[PDB]
């Protein structure tokens, strides 16, 4: 699904560890 797909990368961009 697109909400699927988007807030994927954000989660990881939110992350960087």
Known sequence: SAA???A??????MAKG
């Open 4 to 6: 699927e797909a988007y």
């Open 8 to 13: 994927k990368r954000i989660a990881e961009a």
